[PDB]
Amino acid sequence: MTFEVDPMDEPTLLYVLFEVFDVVRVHRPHRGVIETVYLRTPFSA
Amino acid sequence: MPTIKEGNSRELMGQQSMPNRPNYIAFRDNFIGLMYYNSTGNMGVLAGQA
Amino acid sequence: GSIPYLDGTFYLNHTFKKVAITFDSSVSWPGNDRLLTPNEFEIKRSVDGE
Amino acid sequence: LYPIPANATNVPISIPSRNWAAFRGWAFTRLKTKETPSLGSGYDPYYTYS
């Protein structure tokens, strides 16, 4: 990716959001038991 | 300031006053910043004691 | 003088601050929440992290 | 977050070959380093802005 921006006399940041699916599946099989399944795609953690 | 000279003088009779800039201070919208999020070192916890 | 690269007379190891290892632009090694500061290898801390 | 040095005008970014299935798209802005606290830690010694 190549961004072209107006010049600024101060340090700045180019903030990029890569749109994906950031999901969780919650399982609660028994009393006082929480199991989770995280899945982030693309860009898996 | 008419003079960088201490002590009361006829000179100081010409000094001018101006209100200070307004400055609001408070907690953020939706309490942003209060709780840690997306920080590996200070990760929240929700777990079954079991 | 001595040539560390060839002789092993290393003497600058104390200048390292930290190391971050990443596979495929996204995966942090070793990740898995192993280290106190999981996202990287912190060789040394300055006062603030005593 | 990618840094844009003062007066810089070109910002090239590279993403090493990876998987793109389910990719939804891009969204972006530009922030001032001064107004962006560092989140890669519990405390930002260089954050002097409120």
mmCIF file of C-alpha atoms in Angstrom:
data_model
loop_
_atom_site.group_PDB
_atom_site.id
_atom_site.type_symbol
_atom_site.label_atom_id
_atom_site.label_comp_id
_atom_site.label_asym_id
_atom_site.label_seq_id
_atom_site.Cartn_x
_atom_site.Cartn_y
_atom_site.Cartn_z
ATOM 1 C CA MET A 1 0.000 0.000 0.000
ATOM 2 C CA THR A 2 1.177 3.471 -0.825
ATOM 3 C CA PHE A 3 -0.317 6.514 0.769
ATOM 4 C CA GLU A 4 0.259 10.073 -0.307
ATOM 5 C CA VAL A 5 -0.499 12.739 2.246
ATOM 6 C CA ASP A 6 -0.177 16.444 2.753
ATOM 7 C CA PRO A 7 2.941 17.354 4.679
ATOM 8 C CA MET A 8 2.669 18.229 8.337
ATOM 9 C CA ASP A 9 5.357 19.897 10.412
ATOM 10 C CA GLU A 10 4.865 17.324 13.135
ATOM 11 C CA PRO A 11 5.144 13.594 13.624
ATOM 12 C CA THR A 12 1.908 11.887 12.719
ATOM 13 C CA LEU A 13 0.525 8.423 12.223
ATOM 14 C CA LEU A 14 -1.259 6.680 9.421
ATOM 15 C CA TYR A 15 -3.934 4.598 11.091
ATOM 16 C CA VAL A 16 -5.047 1.551 9.138
ATOM 17 C CA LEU A 17 -7.948 -0.691 10.024
ATOM 18 C CA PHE A 18 -7.877 -4.060 8.362
ATOM 19 C CA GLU A 19 -11.507 -5.138 8.340
ATOM 20 C CA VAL A 20 -12.023 -8.746 9.378
ATOM 21 C CA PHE A 21 -14.009 -11.098 11.501
ATOM 22 C CA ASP A 22 -13.261 -10.930 15.196
ATOM 23 C CA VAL A 23 -15.402 -13.609 16.780
ATOM 24 C CA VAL A 24 -15.931 -15.728 19.853
ATOM 25 C CA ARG A 25 -17.998 -18.811 20.573
ATOM 26 C CA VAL A 26 -18.971 -19.402 24.185
ATOM 27 C CA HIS A 27 -19.437 -22.875 25.619
ATOM 28 C CA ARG A 28 -20.868 -23.489 29.079
ATOM 29 C CA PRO A 29 -21.011 -27.276 29.504
ATOM 30 C CA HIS A 30 -21.219 -27.291 33.305
ATOM 31 C CA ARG A 31 -21.783 -25.304 36.461
ATOM 32 C CA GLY A 32 -18.991 -22.754 36.836
ATOM 33 C CA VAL A 33 -17.345 -23.660 33.528
ATOM 34 C CA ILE A 34 -16.759 -21.202 30.695
ATOM 35 C CA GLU A 35 -14.879 -22.274 27.607
ATOM 36 C CA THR A 36 -14.228 -19.937 24.699
ATOM 37 C CA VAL A 37 -13.109 -20.215 21.131
ATOM 38 C CA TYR A 38 -11.636 -17.130 19.555
ATOM 39 C CA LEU A 39 -11.179 -16.775 15.834
ATOM 40 C CA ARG A 40 -9.893 -13.731 14.001
ATOM 41 C CA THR A 41 -9.726 -13.837 10.230
ATOM 42 C CA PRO A 42 -8.041 -12.785 8.410
ATOM 43 C CA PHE A 43 -5.067 -11.783 10.575
ATOM 44 C CA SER A 44 -5.271 -14.665 13.024
ATOM 45 C CA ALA A 45 -3.727 -13.995 16.427
ATOM 46 C CA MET B 1 3.184 44.861 32.215
ATOM 47 C CA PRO B 2 4.595 48.372 31.974
ATOM 48 C CA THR B 3 7.827 47.502 33.798
ATOM 49 C CA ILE B 4 9.826 44.510 34.915
ATOM 50 C CA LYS B 5 10.554 46.600 37.986
ATOM 51 C CA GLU B 6 9.309 45.407 41.335
ATOM 52 C CA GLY B 7 7.481 47.607 43.810
ATOM 53 C CA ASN B 8 4.439 49.799 43.458
ATOM 54 C CA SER B 9 4.905 52.798 41.194
ATOM 55 C CA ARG B 10 2.953 55.283 39.157
ATOM 56 C CA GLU B 11 4.047 53.031 36.319
ATOM 57 C CA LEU B 12 2.026 50.023 37.485
ATOM 58 C CA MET B 13 -1.108 52.140 37.315
ATOM 59 C CA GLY B 14 -1.090 51.329 33.627
ATOM 60 C CA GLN B 15 -1.062 47.559 33.940
ATOM 61 C CA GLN B 16 -3.872 45.646 32.267
ATOM 62 C CA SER B 17 -5.727 42.558 33.369
ATOM 63 C CA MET B 18 -7.188 39.797 31.235
ATOM 64 C CA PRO B 19 -9.227 36.712 32.122
ATOM 65 C CA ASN B 20 -7.545 33.342 32.102
ATOM 66 C CA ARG B 21 -8.317 30.821 29.403
ATOM 67 C CA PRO B 22 -11.217 28.539 30.156
ATOM 68 C CA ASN B 23 -10.127 25.018 30.974
ATOM 69 C CA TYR B 24 -12.569 22.182 31.460
ATOM 70 C CA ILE B 25 -11.381 19.010 33.115
ATOM 71 C CA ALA B 26 -13.328 15.807 33.556
ATOM 72 C CA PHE B 27 -13.592 12.088 32.957
ATOM 73 C CA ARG B 28 -13.909 10.998 29.337
ATOM 74 C CA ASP B 29 -16.880 10.088 27.215
ATOM 75 C CA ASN B 30 -17.981 6.625 28.286
ATOM 76 C CA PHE B 31 -15.166 6.532 30.836
ATOM 77 C CA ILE B 32 -12.653 5.840 28.128
ATOM 78 C CA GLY B 33 -9.196 5.086 29.545
ATOM 79 C CA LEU B 34 -10.430 4.061 32.994
ATOM 80 C CA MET B 35 -10.292 0.356 32.327
ATOM 81 C CA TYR B 36 -7.478 -1.405 30.549
ATOM 82 C CA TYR B 37 -8.301 -3.110 27.271
ATOM 83 C CA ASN B 38 -6.179 -4.579 24.523
ATOM 84 C CA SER B 39 -3.119 -4.675 26.764
ATOM 85 C CA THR B 40 -1.383 -8.008 27.291
ATOM 86 C CA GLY B 41 0.195 -6.856 30.549
ATOM 87 C CA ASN B 42 -3.055 -5.782 32.204
ATOM 88 C CA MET B 43 -5.510 -8.308 30.832
ATOM 89 C CA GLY B 44 -8.972 -8.664 32.338
ATOM 90 C CA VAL B 45 -10.174 -11.946 33.737
ATOM 91 C CA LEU B 46 -13.386 -13.910 33.605
ATOM 92 C CA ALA B 47 -13.118 -17.472 34.674
ATOM 93 C CA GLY B 48 -15.023 -20.186 36.352
ATOM 94 C CA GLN B 49 -13.451 -20.963 39.672
ATOM 95 C CA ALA B 50 -14.055 -24.521 38.540
ATOM 96 C CA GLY C 1 42.774 -4.948 18.589
ATOM 97 C CA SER C 2 40.589 -7.872 19.571
ATOM 98 C CA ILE C 3 38.053 -8.950 16.963
ATOM 99 C CA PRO C 4 34.930 -10.136 18.754
ATOM 100 C CA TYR C 5 33.332 -11.496 15.591
ATOM 101 C CA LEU C 6 36.203 -13.948 15.262
ATOM 102 C CA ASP C 7 37.588 -14.368 18.778
ATOM 103 C CA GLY C 8 34.586 -14.178 21.114
ATOM 104 C CA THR C 9 35.726 -11.135 23.035
ATOM 105 C CA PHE C 10 32.129 -9.950 23.235
ATOM 106 C CA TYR C 11 31.520 -6.982 25.493
ATOM 107 C CA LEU C 12 28.388 -5.125 24.395
ATOM 108 C CA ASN C 13 25.576 -7.407 25.566
ATOM 109 C CA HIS C 14 24.355 -4.958 28.172
ATOM 110 C CA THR C 15 23.182 -2.548 25.477
ATOM 111 C CA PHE C 16 20.219 -4.628 24.426
ATOM 112 C CA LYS C 17 16.815 -3.432 25.512
ATOM 113 C CA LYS C 18 14.334 -5.813 23.967
ATOM 114 C CA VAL C 19 13.513 -8.211 21.182
ATOM 115 C CA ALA C 20 10.283 -8.776 19.339
ATOM 116 C CA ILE C 21 9.915 -11.833 17.140
ATOM 117 C CA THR C 22 7.198 -12.165 14.526
ATOM 118 C CA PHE C 23 6.302 -14.799 12.003
ATOM 119 C CA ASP C 24 4.241 -14.013 8.914
ATOM 120 C CA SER C 25 3.666 -10.343 9.772
ATOM 121 C CA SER C 26 1.067 -11.231 12.391
ATOM 122 C CA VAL C 27 2.059 -14.103 14.650
ATOM 123 C CA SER C 28 4.047 -13.305 17.761
ATOM 124 C CA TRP C 29 6.586 -15.866 18.904
ATOM 125 C CA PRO C 30 6.482 -17.391 21.339
ATOM 126 C CA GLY C 31 3.114 -15.792 22.086
ATOM 127 C CA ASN C 32 0.879 -18.176 24.043
ATOM 128 C CA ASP C 33 0.949 -15.783 26.991
ATOM 129 C CA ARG C 34 4.233 -17.296 28.145
ATOM 130 C CA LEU C 35 6.234 -14.240 29.293
ATOM 131 C CA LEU C 36 5.392 -11.521 31.836
ATOM 132 C CA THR C 37 5.405 -9.179 28.841
ATOM 133 C CA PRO C 38 4.169 -11.717 26.314
ATOM 134 C CA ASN C 39 4.594 -9.616 23.174
ATOM 135 C CA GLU C 40 8.353 -9.501 23.324
ATOM 136 C CA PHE C 41 11.578 -10.337 25.049
ATOM 137 C CA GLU C 42 12.449 -7.585 27.491
ATOM 138 C CA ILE C 43 16.136 -7.771 28.320
ATOM 139 C CA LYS C 44 16.129 -4.983 30.908
ATOM 140 C CA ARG C 45 13.852 -2.338 32.482
ATOM 141 C CA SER C 46 14.503 1.209 33.701
ATOM 142 C CA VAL C 47 13.276 2.135 37.193
ATOM 143 C CA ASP C 48 9.671 2.420 36.091
ATOM 144 C CA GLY C 49 9.475 -1.362 35.832
ATOM 145 C CA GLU C 50 11.556 -2.304 38.864
ATOM 146 C CA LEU D 1 -0.242 2.401 13.207
ATOM 147 C CA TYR D 2 2.516 3.541 10.883
ATOM 148 C CA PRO D 3 4.673 6.538 11.527
ATOM 149 C CA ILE D 4 4.735 9.569 9.290
ATOM 150 C CA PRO D 5 7.807 11.646 9.959
ATOM 151 C CA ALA D 6 7.398 15.380 9.984
ATOM 152 C CA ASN D 7 7.222 16.678 6.446
ATOM 153 C CA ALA D 8 7.100 13.160 5.046
ATOM 154 C CA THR D 9 4.728 12.847 2.111
ATOM 155 C CA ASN D 10 5.045 9.242 1.037
ATOM 156 C CA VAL D 11 3.899 6.364 3.203
ATOM 157 C CA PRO D 12 4.614 2.899 1.938
ATOM 158 C CA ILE D 13 3.383 -0.107 3.822
ATOM 159 C CA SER D 14 4.180 -3.724 3.295
ATOM 160 C CA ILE D 15 2.416 -6.850 4.435
ATOM 161 C CA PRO D 16 4.303 -10.072 4.033
ATOM 162 C CA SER D 17 2.494 -12.731 2.084
ATOM 163 C CA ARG D 18 -0.407 -14.077 4.094
ATOM 164 C CA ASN D 19 -3.949 -15.407 3.878
ATOM 165 C CA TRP D 20 -6.756 -13.093 2.810
ATOM 166 C CA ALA D 21 -9.853 -15.250 2.936
ATOM 167 C CA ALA D 22 -12.807 -13.393 4.452
ATOM 168 C CA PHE D 23 -11.026 -10.070 4.124
ATOM 169 C CA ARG D 24 -13.609 -7.294 4.346
ATOM 170 C CA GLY D 25 -11.737 -4.162 3.338
ATOM 171 C CA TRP D 26 -9.791 -1.149 4.535
ATOM 172 C CA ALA D 27 -10.525 1.862 6.701
ATOM 173 C CA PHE D 28 -8.081 4.627 7.561
ATOM 174 C CA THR D 29 -7.221 8.002 9.059
ATOM 175 C CA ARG D 30 -4.287 9.990 10.281
ATOM 176 C CA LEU D 31 -3.402 10.833 13.865
ATOM 177 C CA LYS D 32 -0.921 13.034 15.604
ATOM 178 C CA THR D 33 1.752 11.186 17.473
ATOM 179 C CA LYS D 34 1.361 13.664 20.311
ATOM 180 C CA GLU D 35 -2.305 12.774 20.696
ATOM 181 C CA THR D 36 -1.750 9.021 20.634
ATOM 182 C CA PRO D 37 -0.697 7.500 23.916
ATOM 183 C CA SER D 38 1.399 4.375 23.626
ATOM 184 C CA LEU D 39 -0.673 1.321 24.419
ATOM 185 C CA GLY D 40 2.042 -1.312 24.184
ATOM 186 C CA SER D 41 2.456 -0.909 27.937
ATOM 187 C CA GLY D 42 0.802 -0.155 31.257
ATOM 188 C CA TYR D 43 2.345 3.328 31.350
ATOM 189 C CA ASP D 44 3.570 5.891 28.806
ATOM 190 C CA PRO D 45 6.314 8.055 30.247
ATOM 191 C CA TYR D 46 6.330 10.258 27.142
ATOM 192 C CA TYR D 47 2.603 11.039 27.097
ATOM 193 C CA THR D 48 2.232 14.708 28.034
ATOM 194 C CA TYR D 49 -1.183 15.482 26.611
ATOM 195 C CA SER D 50 -4.725 15.352 27.979
#
